[PDB]
Amino acid sequence: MNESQIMQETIPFLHLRKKDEFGNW
Amino acid sequence: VRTFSQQEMAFNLLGLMAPAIVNLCQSDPVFADLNGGLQFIPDLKGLM
Structure with a gap:
């Protein structure tokens, strides 16, 4: 719901x- | 969750028309979820 408040390695190019x-998404 | 009357929605809209926000727009586009929080009822069409 609010990622920004709570949290204030690799992704494949494909x-x-x-x-x-x-x-x- | 909440649904609106037109007069309410007009109110809400006229709200974004108010000087406060108008100046925000002049520096930055404004998103403005005026949905009655139905963003949480999933498969709303099914429910209905």
């Missing part, structure tokens, strides 16, 4: 994604 409960 990746798939999935949708969050809050339609996020």
Whole structure:
């Protein structure tokens, strides 16, 4: 819900994604 | 969760029309979720 408050290695150049409960890829 | 009357929505909109926000817009585009928090009811169409 609020990532910004709570939190204030590698990703592949080619990746798939999935949708969050809050339609996020 | 909450649904609105038109007069309410107009109010809310006229809100973004107010000088405070208007100046925000002049420096930066404004997002403004005026959804009744339905952002949490998933498969809303199914529920309905």
